[PDB]
Design a protein around this ligand. Structure first.
Ligand code: UD1
Ligand code: UD1
Ligand code: UD1
Ligand code: CL
Ligand code: CL
Ligand code: CL
Ligand code: CL
Ligand code: CL
Ligand code: CL
Ligand code: CL
Ligand code: CL
Ligand code: CL
Ligand code: CL
Ligand code: CL
Ligand code: CL
Ligand code: CL
Ligand code: CL
Ligand code: CL
Ligand code: CL
Ligand code: CL
Ligand code: CL
Ligand code: CL
Ligand code: CL
Ligand code: MG
Ligand code: MG
Ligand code: MG
Ligand code: MG
Ligand code: MG
Lengths: 313, 312, 311
C-alpha cells in the first residue's frame, strides 16, 4: 500500500515551536495511515532542543538527521524526495502550519482531476493572491491563473513527475532555487489544480547576483527545453511573461538608482544582461509595454539607461 | 504652347474617377488653353478604369504603361515628357479641382513671373495649413511661408525649370519621392506664389535604405543649390528641413514602436549615416526641443532616441 | 605686531579707488593696530590709479608689480609676504568695509581663538545660508554651509597661511579663490561667523585650467591634516561635488548653444577630474544629482543632456 502523500519537512534550530507544526500535520482529516511526515533535520545544534521535540513524535514520523548543516532547505528536501515512495509529496517548512483538511482536500481534488500539481490557498500569521481569486480551478494555466506569481514549492507535487524527470533542488544558489524547482515541474507536466476552500497552508512570519542569475538562467532554459510546451511561440510567450514577473517582483529590481556601490551595480547588471541576452528577443513583445525601455537598457548592459528608465517609471 | 498641362496618373479608380475628370474639363480657363494628360499605370481592374477613360476620347490625351510602375513617379515622368506647355499641374486621380483652379493660379503666376504657384487645399472625408494663413503671397520665402510643410507636387510648376535642370521623379524610392521633386525644383528656382481665395485643390480621403537615400538627396539638393549659394543660408535651409523631418518624417516614433529590434537598428543606422553627411552648422537652426533626439540620431544610439521620444 | 593687515590688489581703478580706501582708513579699530597693504598689478591707466594711491603715502603700505599678472593671485601673494600681522583680510579694490569690520571681526576671532572669521556680506547675489543661524563661534563646514561661501573676502589667521605655505595659485583665472579658502579650511580647525552688521559690501573655456584647479580642491580635501579620517574626507568631497553641480561654471553646458566639439572637450575635462575623486564620496552627494554625476563619470554627453532635462 503506497501512501497517498509524504509531507517533507526540513528542520533547523526550531526548538519547542516545532510542536505546533508537527501537530498540524499529525492532525489531518486524511486517514493517518494514508500519509507520512518525513522530517529531515539539517544538523541542528540548539543544545538538542529541536531533536528533543522530534523524539516526542518517534514512531509517528520518519526521521533522518543530516551530519552537517547544508545552510538551506535544498539538501534536506532532496533527502526527503529519495525517502518518499508516495503518490504525491507536499513540502512544509518547519515554521508553518497545515489546515486540518489540507492533505485530504488537495489529494482528493488532485485524484479527481488527474492533477500533477495541486496548489492550496495560503494564509498568513503576523502571500500570493491573483492565483486564488477565481475559486477552485480543476485545469489551471500558468499565464491565465498567475502561477508565475506563486512559485514557492509549498504545494502538492505528483511524485512520478519528479522521479521520471529527476527534478532535484539545486544547491548552487541560496535564492530563487524554489522558483526553479516549481518551474522545472510545471515545464514537465500538464495538469495543475488550484484549491481555495480554506487557507490550507499558513505561512508564519518571524550579493553579486552570480548565483541568483544562474538560477534565473535555468528557469529560461527549462521553458525553452520543455517537453510539454514544445511550440516555439508558446515558449516565447512563457518566457516574456516570466520576464514581466522578474521586472515586477525580482530581487533588487530597483538596484540602478540604489545605494549599492558602483562596482556591485556593474556586476549585478552584467549578470542580468548576459542572462536576458540568452533569451530570444521574440519573447520581449509579451512583456508589459511600460517595461520597454528598462528591458532594452538591461539587454544593452547600460547602467545609465537603466537609471533613466527607472526614473521614468 | 498650351497654358496648363494637367498630368493625372490613374490606377484602378473605377466609376468614381468621373467626378475628377469633369472637375478638370469644367474649368473657367479657355477649353483650348489647357490639356488633361491621363497616364494609366497599367490598371488591372478588369477594364473598369479603362472604360471610364475611353468615354473622354477626343477630350483628353492618354498613354498607358506596359506594366504597373507601383506609384505615381514613372507615370508623372511620362506626363512631363509628353507635355510641351508653359506650366504643369499634377493632379491625383481621386482629387478634385475647383472650377477656377487653373485660371486663377495661372493668371497669378503669369502676373508675378512665378516658377511655382500653390493653391489652398480643401478636404472631403473624416493638408498643409500654415502656408496659407497670410493669404496670397506674390514672392514667398521657403522658411517664412512654411513651404517645407507643404512639399506635395499638387501645385502649378513652370515647365522650363523642369526641362532645363532635368528634374525627374526618382523611381528607386516608394516614399518621399514627391518631397525630393519639390525641393529640387525649389533649389533651382526663385519665384514662388501662394493663392488662397478658394480651396482650389480638394484632397479626397522598408529598412530605410531607399527612404534615407531620398532624404540624403534632399540635403544634397540644398547644399548644391545654384539659387541659395551662401554657405550659411544652406545651413539654415538644411536645419529647417531637419526640424520638418523630425516633426513629420516617416516612422518618426520608430524607437518605442512595435518594430522588431533588428529593424530599429537598421532604420536608425540609415538615419544616422544620412544625418552625419549634414554639417553640424545646420543643427543650431533646429527647434531646441529636438536637440537631444537629433544628437541621439547623430550618435546612432537607439536607447537615447527611445529616451528622447519619452521626454517629448 | 599689527592685529590686521588688509591686503587690497588694484588694477585701473582710477578715482573710484578713493571710496574703498576711505572705507578702510575710517575703521573703529585703532589706526596703529592695522595696516592697509595696496599692491597695484601694474595699472596702465595713464598714471590715474597710481596717482590716487600716492595721496595716502605714509598712511598705507604700497608696492607696484613690474608687470600685470591678470588677476588677484600674484598681487595677493605679494601682500601676504609683506604682512607680519596676526590676521589678514582680503579686500577687493571695488568693495567697501563697514566701519566696525576690522574691530568686531578681530575681537570675535580673538575671543574664540578663530583661524577664520567670516563677516556677513552686503551688496550695492552673495552667500546667505552661512549667515542664517546668527553668530557662530565654532562653525562646521557642512552644518554652516561654508562650501557655498568660499570667497577670500574674510579674516584669516596669518600663522596658518605661513606654516602651511598657502599661496594663491596662478594656474587658471577661475576658482583660484575657492582653492585658497579650501586649502586654509583643510589646515585649520576654528572658524567663526559674525552677522551683527553687513561688514563687507560686494559692489557689482576648454575647461583645462579650470578643471585643474577643481582637481586641486579635491586633493586639498583628501590630504587634509585636520579632517584626517577617510570617511570624513569622502563626506567633505561629496558635499563639494554637490556645490560643484549646484553652482559650478557652465553647470548646464550639456543642453546649451555651445558647439558640440566644445561640449565634448568640456565634459572630457570634467570627467577626467571627477574620476580622480573616489566613488566612496558619491553617496554623500544630494541624491537628485545621482544620474548627472554618473553621466559625467561615464563621459557620456547624451546621459548628461538627459540628466539635465530630468532636473
Ligand atoms: C516569503 C518567502 O520568501 N518564503 C520562503 C522562505 O521561507 P523562510 O524565509 O520563512 O525560510 P524558513 O526559515 O521557513 O526556512 C525554510 C526551510 O528550510 C529549512 N532550513 C533552514 C536553514 C537551514 O540551514 N537548513 C534548513 O533545512 C527550515 O527548517 C525550513 O523548513 O524560504 C523558504 C525556503 O526556500 C521558502 O520555502 C519560502 O517560501
Ligand atoms: C495625404 C498624402 O500624403 N497624400 C499623398 C499620397 O496620395 P494618396 O495616399 O491619396 O494616394 P492616391 O490614391 O491619391 O494615389 C496617388 C497617385 O498615384 C497614382 N498611382 C497609384 C498606384 C500606382 O500603382 N500607380 C499610380 O500611378 C494614383 O492613381 C494617384 O494619381 O501619395 C501621392 C503620390 O505620392 C501624393 O501626391 C499625395 O500627396
Ligand atoms: C561675485 C564674485 O564671485 N566675485 C569675485 C570676483 O570679483 P570681481 O568680479 O568683482 O573682480 P574684481 O574686478 O573685483 O577683481 C578682484 C581683484 O583683483 C584685482 N585685479 C584685477 C585684475 C588684474 O589684472 N589684477 C588685479 O589685481 C582687482 O583690482 C580686484 O582687487 O573675482 C574676485 C577675485 O577672484 C573675487 O574676490 C570675487 O569674490
Ligand atoms: Cl503532542
Ligand atoms: Cl508507535
Ligand atoms: Cl542534495
Ligand atoms: Cl474549474
Ligand atoms: Cl499558459
Ligand atoms: Cl503571467
Ligand atoms: Cl512573484
Ligand atoms: Cl507561492
Ligand atoms: Cl530545481
Ligand atoms: Cl524543461
Ligand atoms: Cl526573484
Ligand atoms: Cl531615482
Ligand atoms: Cl522607463
Ligand atoms: Cl510636406
Ligand atoms: Cl525604405
Ligand atoms: Cl518624410
Ligand atoms: Cl524584437
Ligand atoms: Cl554642504
Ligand atoms: Cl576627521
Ligand atoms: Cl565653480
Ligand atoms: Mg486523520
Ligand atoms: Mg518559513
Ligand atoms: Mg488621393
Ligand atoms: Mg544613454
Ligand atoms: Mg569686485
Amino acid at each position: 500500500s503506497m501512501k497517498k502523500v509524504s509531507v517533507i519537512m526540513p528542520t533547523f534550530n526550531n526548538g519547542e515551536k516545532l510542536h505546533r507544526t508537527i501537530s498540524s500535520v499529525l492532525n489531518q482529516t486524511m486517514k493517518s495511515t494514508d500519509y507520512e511526515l518525513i522530517i529531515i533535520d539539517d544538523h541542528s545544534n540548539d543544545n538538542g532542543e529541536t531533536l528533543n521535540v522530534i523524539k516526542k513524535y518517534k514512531g509517528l514520523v520518519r526521521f533522518k538527521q543530516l551530519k552537517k548543516n547544508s545552510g538551506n532547505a535544498s539538501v534536506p528536501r532532496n533527502t526527503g524526495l529519495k525517502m518518499s515512495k508516495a503518490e504525491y509529496v507536499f513540502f512544509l517548512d518547519s515554521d508553518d502550519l497545515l489546515h486540518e483538511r489540507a492533505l485530504e482536500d488537495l489529494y482528493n481534488y488532485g485524484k479527481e482531476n488527474n492533477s500533477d500539481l495541486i496548489i492550496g490557498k495560503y494564509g498568513v500569521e503576523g502571500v500570493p493572491k491573483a492565483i486564488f481569486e477565481k475559486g477552485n480551478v480543476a485545469k489551471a494555466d500558468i499565464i491565465d491563473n498567475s502561477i508565475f506569481y506563486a512559485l514557492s514549492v509549498l504545494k502538492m507535487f505528483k511524485k512520478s513527475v519528479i522521479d521520471k524527470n529527476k527534478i532535484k533542488f539545486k544547491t548552487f544558489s541560496k535564492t530563487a532555487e524554489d522558483q526553479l524547482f516549481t518551474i522545472e515541474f510545471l515545464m514537465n507536466s500538464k495538469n495543475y489544480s488550484i484549491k481555495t476552500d480554506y487557507e490550507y497552508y499558513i505561512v508564519v512570519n518571524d550579493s553579486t547576483g552570480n548565483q541568483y542569475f544562474a538560477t534565473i538562467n535555468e528557469i529560461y532554459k527549462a521553458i525553452y527545453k520543455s517537453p510539454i510546451y514544445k511550440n516555439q511561440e508558446k515558449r516565447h510567450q512563457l518566457a516574456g511573461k516570466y520576464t514581466t514577473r522578474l521586472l515586477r517582483h525580482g530581487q533588487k529590481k530597483n538596484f540602478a538608482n540604489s545605494k549599492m556601490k558602483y562596482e556591485d551595480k556593474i556586476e549585478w547588471l552584467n549578470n542580468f544582461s548576459k542572462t536576458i541576452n540568452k533569451v530570444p528577443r521574440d519573447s520581449d513583445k509579451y512583456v508589459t509595454q511600460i517595461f520597454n525601455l528598462k528591458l532594452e537598457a538591461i539587454r544593452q548592459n547600460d547602467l545609465l539607461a537603466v537609471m533613466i528608465a527607472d526614473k521614468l517609471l
